[PDB]
Structure 1
Amino acid sequence: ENQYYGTGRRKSSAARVFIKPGNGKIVINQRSLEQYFGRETARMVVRQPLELVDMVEKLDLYITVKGGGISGQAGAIRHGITRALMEYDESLRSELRKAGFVTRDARQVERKKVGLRKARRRPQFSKR
């Protein structure tokens, strides 16, 4: 048909979302949403874009996500759904922007630096 596509990205994760005009089914890596995300917050974060611009029962989406962890994959899925919705409708841009879903969160990590035990954690100092 159309298979409206959207690529979402989060710190190390990459999601591919295919929206289709059908019922309200979510298929993530040949799993149900509840099967994949045991986190209720992750489920809700995936819900968020559909709930805002009401399309929950109007769209089938097929999702495949690679890399990252639970929250990263959920964020990437949300970003991809938002992008797919924008491509599909193009009128929801303003609502999605004001919600805050269009922006790609660019915070990945701070590398460990020589001399510091972590990215910024400095070794303990002594005066004497």
Structure 2
Amino acid sequence: RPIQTVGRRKEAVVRVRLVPGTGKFDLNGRSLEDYFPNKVHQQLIKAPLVTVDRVESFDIFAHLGGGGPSGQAGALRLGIARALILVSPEDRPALKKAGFLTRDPRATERKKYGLKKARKAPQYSKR
């Protein structure tokens, strides 16, 4: 009964299959470098499993979808944290203190009629 969790960031959904192994990222047939070439993203993923422990160990492969690259990175981070909680509950206080288990509700605010954007307004121009 494998450890399967999910994480969502903006509109992206990532399904993880946390699994014992050597330590390796498979992202629909791609490595971590192949999928997220950005170093900031490469830190954002696997920030949680190194925030306390541990550290480069048992590997993961996960399905990606929706959103953009940064949203998928954040969703993968959340999924990894949730999977670690499931597989070993002892370090729950550590990850919760680090703030890696919060879903981070931040959606695109909807456009509003009479405005150019969510908040942007046309030039007022008294007179």
Rounded to whole Å, the distance in 1 between the matches of 2:91 and 2:67 is 28
Structure 2 runs not aligned, ≥5 long: none
The answer to whether the 8 Å contact 1:22/1:57 transfers is: no
RMSD between aligned residues: 1.0
Structure 1 runs not aligned, ≥5 long: none
Number of matched pairs: 127
Task: Give me the TM-score of the superposition, normalised by structure 1.
Answer: 0.95
Task: Give me the TM-score of the superposition, normalised by structure 2.
Answer: 0.95
**Partner amino acid, structure 2, of 1:126:** S
In the TM superposition, what is the alpha-carbon distance from 1:94 to its structure 2 partner? 0.7
Alignment map for 1:35-74 (pairs within 5 Å): 35-74=34-73
Structure 1 or 2: more strand by fraction? 1
In the TM superposition, what is the alpha-carbon distance from 1:56 to its structure 2 partner? 2.9
Alignment correspondent of 1:93: 92
The answer to whether the 8 Å contact 1:78/1:101 transfers is: yes
1:71-113 per-residue CA deviation (whole Å, 9 max, x = no partner) reads 1000000000000000100112111111110000111110000
Identity of aligned residues (%): 50
Alignment map for 1:1-128 (pairs within 5 Å): 2-128=1-127
**Partner amino acid, structure 2, of 1:108:** A
Rounded to whole Å, the distance in 1 between the matches of 2:64 and 2:120 is 33
Rounded to whole Å, the distance in 2 between the matches of 1:56 and 1:6 is 20
**Partner amino acid, structure 2, of 1:79:** L
